[model samples]
Target chain A: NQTDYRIFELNKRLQNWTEECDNLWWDAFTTEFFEDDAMLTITFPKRYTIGRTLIPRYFRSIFEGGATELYYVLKHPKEAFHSNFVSLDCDQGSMVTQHGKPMFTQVCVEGRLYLEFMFDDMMRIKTWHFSIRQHRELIPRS
Target chain B: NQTDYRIFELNKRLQNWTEECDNLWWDAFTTEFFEDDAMLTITFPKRYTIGRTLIPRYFRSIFEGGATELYYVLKHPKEAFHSNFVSLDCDQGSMVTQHGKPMFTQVCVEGRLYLEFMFDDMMRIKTWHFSIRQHRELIPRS
Candidate 1:
């Protein structure tokens, strides 16, 4: 019974994490999502960071650097019936950004990120690792 | 009830896939586990191969190249109640290999691969994507 309930709560938090990421609210996303000892690993140019504070900070640079992303959706978490691990897949369409000063537009590219995760007993992310890789012309240029 | 039944069947096939991989049974692993249209994507110098034939063939090179992987265990599947997606995480302790002639003993390194999967109506793998990245000295060499 407790396992079922905890899974439910974790699912809710997972949804909240996805929504906050969409809104580019890095701090808000980390507020109730990551455990203090959680590990965050990003691939190629691979980097690893830990805990809520550092995790959100790393994300801020990423989110800010990649602004005006056309559309990126983090698909819902897929959880197992009796396990604490989950997977989420994501895809993006032509994410382009504007740079410093009067701002110049950047080129567009498509991206894919599939992540596997684990959460601690308190229903906060304990392990989050992913590779956000983009390839040119996955779909035709629009 | 059919969904429930298929999920159970898929889980068994998933286990068999693991066992065959352990025994380096590439052909057997692909036989009943992959849909004709299933896509297999390998990361870092990324390559995507489709169908059971090409998929298994692609894996043969990898499994054969990474011979004598020390204690690499693919953790059991984690599935959602109503979803056909799953995650399998794998870790290895200092995988060292020997190749060709009298052969050379390659140094040990640790690897991590966490995969996200999707299965079709026939309960065969429809999409399999993962990154098998290794780092030096993750654990002390035995």
Candidate 2:
């Protein structure tokens, strides 16, 4: 029953979540990327804070010494996706920094499910790039 | 009619193509990644040749003047899949190189369909990492 609840909640939130996404091209049955028989689960927090310092330009300036649009474009996908897979000790937000300013604007919503893919006999994979928003930059803090 | 023929042809080839792939995790309604109402098409050469020199180790040593297994591991996924998306001028072998040692050892086969996801509008994505093999050194030049 818990598995069904997870699936239902993921489907509901992810589907509705993309409606506001100018970048998401597909309606994303985002759940399709998951394995059916595995212990699928998610644990994203309710209040993700998006501070002005999270924008790539500002963040890069602080950490990389200087930041350019190219670095942002090239690194955005890796930062948004691969970082989560790198470790599970922190919130998905831990992966949100380039040199520390933060990437997303904390668009915190109900559907921000952090899906974990744990197959039958391997280490659990807690990350994947299943969204177009994951590929775009947030509106800079005003 | 041409669309039907293309779908029919693609189905035929992709199915036969996987018989040789040790890692095509799905029967992949592979075409599902594309759009139905749009003119989706592909034209990969059937006779893909895998030669010994093409393996990153041999080729990189010649070009970079030396190389390592780590380079091979990193570049293999890019070579095997990303390279195909890189251009329309050659086969997967085009991504392979040597000072003319003839990379592909003529391991020609018919199902080498390089399905390009050129949509109806304007997203000309020059890259993606979809693949049938996630490993390298194949079964080896036996």
Candidate No. with top TM-score: 1
TM-score of chain A, predicted model 2, versus the true chain A, to 2 decimals: 0.19
TM-scores of the candidates are 0.30, 0.19
Clashing pairs in 2: B49-B104, B50-B105, B51-B104, B51-B105
> Which docking class does model 1 fall in?
incorrect
Candidate 2 ranges with C-alpha deviation above 4 Å: A1-25, A34-115, A118-142, B1-58, B62-142
User: Interface RMSD (C-alpha) of each candidate?
Assistant: 17.8, 21.5
- Per-residue accuracy of model 2 over A30-137 as CA lDDT, tens digit each: 224333232322234332322222222222232233221111111101112243232222122112221123431212111222434442333333342212222222
Count backbone overlaps in model 2: 4
What is the per-residue lDDT of model 1 for residues A1-142, given as tens digits with 9 covering 90 to 100?
Answer: 2222332333333323331365446656565666666777655476554655688776556446743322222322234332655545444312322233333233334444444445445455566665556532211111
DockQ list for all candidates: 0.02, 0.03
Cα lDDT for residue A58, candidate 1: 64
lDDT by residue (B19-106, candidate 1, tens digit) is: 2465346666575666666777655466554555687666556446644322222222234432655545444312333233333233
Q: What's the C-alpha lDDT at position B81 in model 2?
A: 25
